[PDB]
Amino acid sequence: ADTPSSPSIDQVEPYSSTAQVQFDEPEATGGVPILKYKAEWRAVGEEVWHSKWYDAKEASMEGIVTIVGLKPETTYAVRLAALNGKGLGEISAASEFKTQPVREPSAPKLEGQMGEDGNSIKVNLIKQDDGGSPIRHYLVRYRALSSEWKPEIRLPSGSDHVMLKSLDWNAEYEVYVVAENQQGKSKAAHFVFRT
Amino acid sequence: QADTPSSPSIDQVEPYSSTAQVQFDEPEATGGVPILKYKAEWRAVGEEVWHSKWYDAKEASMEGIVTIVGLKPETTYAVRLAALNGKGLGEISAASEFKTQPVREPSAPKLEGQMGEDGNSIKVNLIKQDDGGSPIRHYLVRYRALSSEWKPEIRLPSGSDHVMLKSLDWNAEYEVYVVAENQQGKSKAAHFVFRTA
């Protein structure tokens, strides 16, 4: 039983302040299952590594790990390692990538939560890459699948959620949320649920 | 003083086994009043009757695509779109040819959660997505509270269309991954996060 060999980076898909890393697991687990992945990254030139741990089962199902806290139009070096019952294995070779220039924000992530009533719902906003400049506000569109769209809801950048009230009981609804900054509007995140 | 819309234009078609994603641009001229719906029409090579389906405009606009369903695997089709507004249906787009993929693993399932009134439970309805051209035999469900270890995989019996998560931790965030599996294999995982009260 030994620590895993090094995983290898397939490709990196960077945005403005974050990057998506696709990788292949180590060819030798070492005897015991891979528990976590550790990513190290820093701007080319810097001498201090930034790091983040990622759950292995999650990385396998998602198919990637996302690095955050980067700056626009900047060249970065990233590397990975795997942790098993024995410890951290060999670090991979570093892969270099350049983040996108300042642009429209990425789609935000939506997380449902029980609202004030059964015919209600709290849609939490899991903030995503803002594109390099502060998001100015969130645009929200929603409707019951059976009827017409409700007027658009505008939320300030500070908002951590959006509340949809007075909904029909046990009916299906769909929600779209757009994050907009100075550069433009992001793609729409869509969320479907049943009250 | 308004007029029906001009014709939409199909950029490209990304097909699967029994469905296809149609990427298109909205009509250049709306005509004067907001486009309300899009009408998609498709006909398999050889067949003579055009199948059709209405799609909500706003919905389609936000995703950039309309999804045609009920197609046969390994089959060549022709598809076209038209827009409807206050004045009526506009010009039909040119027809676009595409061929569905052969039978394979299912595409990631669609997840529709129904928050539990008890504040610590949830019903995840499995909305029908492309099955790859072969019936889904089992839905595999992996879930955990972001603060904890994964719970054992829950394999649902063929036929089931939902999974119920109860007795959940309070004030906790949960991630759920659902895999559709048929004769040819497992789909990539569909997922979503939710929070207990």
Numbering used by the authors:
A (entry chain B): 497 to 691
B (entry chain A): 496 to 692
Give the article text.
The neural cell adhesion molecule (NCAM) is the prototype and founding member of the immunoglobulin (Ig) superfamily cell adhesion molecules (CAMs). NCAM is involved in neuronal migration, axon growth and guidance, as well as in synaptic plasticity associated with learning and memory. We conclude that the NCAM–FGFR1 interaction at the cell surface may be transient or stabilised by avidity effects resulting from receptor clustering and that conformational changes within NCAM may have a profound role in FGFR1 activation.
Intriguingly, the corresponding loop regions are in close proximity in the acutely bent conformation observed in crystals of the wild-type protein, suggesting that they are part of a larger FGFR1 binding site extending over the domain junction. The neuroglian tandem, which has an extensive domain interface that incorporates a bound sodium ion, adopts a conformation that is intermediate between the two conformations we report for the NCAM tandem. Thus, a similar bend in the FN3 linker(s) may be a general feature of other animal CAMs containing FN3 domains in their membrane-proximal region.
